[PDB]
Design a protein that fits this description.
homodimer, 429 residues, mainly alpha, Citrate Synthase, domain 1, Cytochrome p450-Terp, domain 2, 2 domains, two-stranded antiparallel sheet, 20 helices, 5 strands, globular, binds carboxymethyl coenzyme *A
Amino acid sequence: ASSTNLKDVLAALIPKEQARIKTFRQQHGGTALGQITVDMSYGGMRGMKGLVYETSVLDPDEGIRFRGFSIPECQKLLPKGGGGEPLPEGLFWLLVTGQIPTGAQVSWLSKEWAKRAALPSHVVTMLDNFPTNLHPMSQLSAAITALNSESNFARAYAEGILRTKYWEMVYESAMDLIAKLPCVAAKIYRNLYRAGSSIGAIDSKLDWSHNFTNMLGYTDAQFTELMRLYLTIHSDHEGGNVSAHTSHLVGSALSDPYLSFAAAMNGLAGPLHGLANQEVLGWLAQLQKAAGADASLRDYIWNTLNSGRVVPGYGHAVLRKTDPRYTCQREFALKHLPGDPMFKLVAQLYKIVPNVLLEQGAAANPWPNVDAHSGVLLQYYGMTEMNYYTVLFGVSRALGVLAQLIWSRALGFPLERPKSMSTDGLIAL
Amino acid sequence: ASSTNLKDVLAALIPKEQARIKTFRQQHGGTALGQITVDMSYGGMRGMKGLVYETSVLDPDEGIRFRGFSIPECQKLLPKGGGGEPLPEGLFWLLVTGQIPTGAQVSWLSKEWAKRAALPSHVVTMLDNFPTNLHPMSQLSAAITALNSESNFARAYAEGILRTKYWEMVYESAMDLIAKLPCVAAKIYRNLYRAGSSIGAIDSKLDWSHNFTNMLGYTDAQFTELMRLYLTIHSDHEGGNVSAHTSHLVGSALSDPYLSFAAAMNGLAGPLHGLANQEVLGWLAQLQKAAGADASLRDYIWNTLNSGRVVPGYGHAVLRKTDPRYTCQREFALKHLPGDPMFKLVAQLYKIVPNVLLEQGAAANPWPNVDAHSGVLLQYYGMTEMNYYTVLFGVSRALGVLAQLIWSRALGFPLERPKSMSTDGLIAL
Ligand SMILES: CC(C)(COP(=O)(O)OP(=O)(O)OC[C@H]1O[C@@H](n2cnc3c(N)ncnc32)[C@H](O)[C@@H]1OP(=O)(O)O)[C@@H](O)C(=O)NCCC(=O)NCCSCC(=O)O
Ligand SMILES: CC(C)(COP(=O)(O)OP(=O)(O)OC[C@H]1O[C@@H](n2cnc3c(N)ncnc32)[C@H](O)[C@@H]1OP(=O)(O)O)[C@@H](O)C(=O)NCCC(=O)NCCSCC(=O)O
């Protein structure tokens, strides 16, 4: 009897996995996975295997996998609006469940996210009073912190629930959070760039992406398509990234999903992380200020490097090859906006940057990452407020980080608390 | 010629250390410090040596050390107001510099923090509109995020400064942040619990703690003393703790000091972390609701344990012995509030809890931690709004986390980005 419900599905799945991890441990907990060196310690845990994170795994060479699903694979397997790009909704189901959802599953997330999307008055209020020189990311992060008012987990914890049920309240507070995000994100949008206008209402019959674009104010049918791919691809990127790890870390301490996502956002906002979004465009934007020669393009990159700055959108802590998310984006451009002069500059940089980066002999991965290609796409559709780009990244990222958060709690992962050491201490060791 | 200035001192100190870490590495980077097992991975990096963090080191048995200075040591060596408890100001100098400051050094932080303490209008505004059911910690964290408007590092980065100078803008934005905190913290205080009143102005001639207590509204001379010790002891606790690690992690991505501290706060707010402050009092507060027998005290602890809850204020991820911060606090009570019935209950719990915790056979460290003893002290002085306690923790914590943040950047520590692994992947490995 009956119909769709992620939670019932999860209820069936938790005990299995719990079991599976206990036996594995019972036999392998003692197993050495790896060693820790000094350089690793001074180096940002680079190359250290430090966390269990289920939803996605990043391969240095091939790039990210949602189960074991690649981006090309997702593209073909995940349900679509009607109609070429994958619905982040179906992405979400996959991440949570390990399985490819049916259209019918997918429609259910959509409605669910539609039903839950509602903002409390104190939040609307704060957003409406924020100054316009407060960065969109700051605005977003303070809003999500402020939503903690409403945390179902915060409240259940205060009532004393058994630790076993944590995952259930997490899940609710995840689903409500994902639901609200686009509203928050769009409110910021409309306040800063469309002053006096309103975000409008959520239509239960649309997919999350589409409601998002309406709230943003965009009509173009291809924009919507852009949005669906963008929000799916930015999903998740394993557990070690600043944003995800931040969530995992904060969430480990039993801070509710709102506080943990917000902290994640503060991490996403750093230049070496998701703000690279934004930095890309600005650098591109200066480049053109200062149709160029590869040689003048090259002088320009050198001048950055010489100046003690990074080239934004290039390099990666884990990837060692061109990001497939980059390829993914390129391939969208080539289909849709192949004559765009911004696009063409990005295409030409691809010819030059890595070469310059090899020449310099510093970057371990001279190839571009997702950030190098995302803004170009946005600008094209008219969304040219580049200090806002990272917000979009932030909305997508909720998908992966929250899908995991639920599992961490389902699995009972304890407090994240490694040991630190000072230089003198290490010197002594 | 000339007078005091932390920054000139740091300018002299950075190059030395830079040098010292390069040679050490040159000879030891390859050295294996440790191994990683499966259990560690599933276990929250427990026992993994994962970070370099200079300011303080925690010993499992003896407890925390500021250089190599113990709490008792600090107590005797750090300058005092006039007059028994150490000035957090002098703590700060120690952490940053490695050296014990002179009174004269100490007076300089004080004035400096006094000069810089000023809140921008959009912040005051948001705090004044926040609802009273928004938790103080949430309020604090959203306020600090919102201050990023003002980040000197955010602005310098946007202008393109050479990476080498980062530490300098960090330092400014650290000193301004520490300066403002008590204002923010007190504004929250006054809005929630003292509605219609005002925090008043900062008097350059007082020490930070004392301005803080005036802003809070407290007159008692011993309260002030309490505040100075409280804010010094809560300083720092090595790099691995959720709050510090969060800052270190977010800061690694070149998010400004404001965003990184705020994220740290979201971590501090979880029940297994700094909110334990608060949880302690509430549990104590229910205990008494429900002068008891050790046996009834024991039934009560069992009922918690049986219920799938933790006993707040007991246990630790690293400490294996009674926290000296706990002893520190106890010893303050015994001097000042030895007949306080709350104090006496906490003293009696000390007799029972660990025993019950040993009996159960789960907790690796059955002894109490700082949180078990802090609120008791506050309540005594009239500060009995326990959902506010963690704010105080948060203000102190700024001291250690920011003192480090400056060094991370001075030392050029890269992006924190370890590798994650899923269960299937590990199973495969
Ligand atoms: C992403 C990174 C932080 C990875 O950092 P890492 O793993 O420490 O890099 P690495 O191992 O190649 O670093 C070796 C050296 O190369 C330098 N280097 C690496 N990437 C670059 C870059 N794009 N421009 C110039 N220098 C660079 C790096 O700064 C370091 O210099 P130094 O030894 O003086 O500190 C780095 O490539 C970078 O700063 N890239 C530019 C910022 C960027 O595009 N960020 C987005 C990352 S992925 C998508 C997202 O996160 O939003
Ligand atoms: C601080 C801790 C999170 C350390 O966590 P840990 O290193 O994973 O603890 P551990 O190695 O002893 O855990 C072994 C088991 O003992 C359980 N345990 C440990 N501490 C306690 C406690 N105080 N009450 C009941 N159960 C406990 C722990 O939950 C785990 O149970 P299970 O295996 O079902 O998950 C834990 O002791 C705890 O939850 N304490 C209560 C909360 C608290 O007082 N927090 C403040 C910590 S220090 C000051 C600050 O951070 O603000």
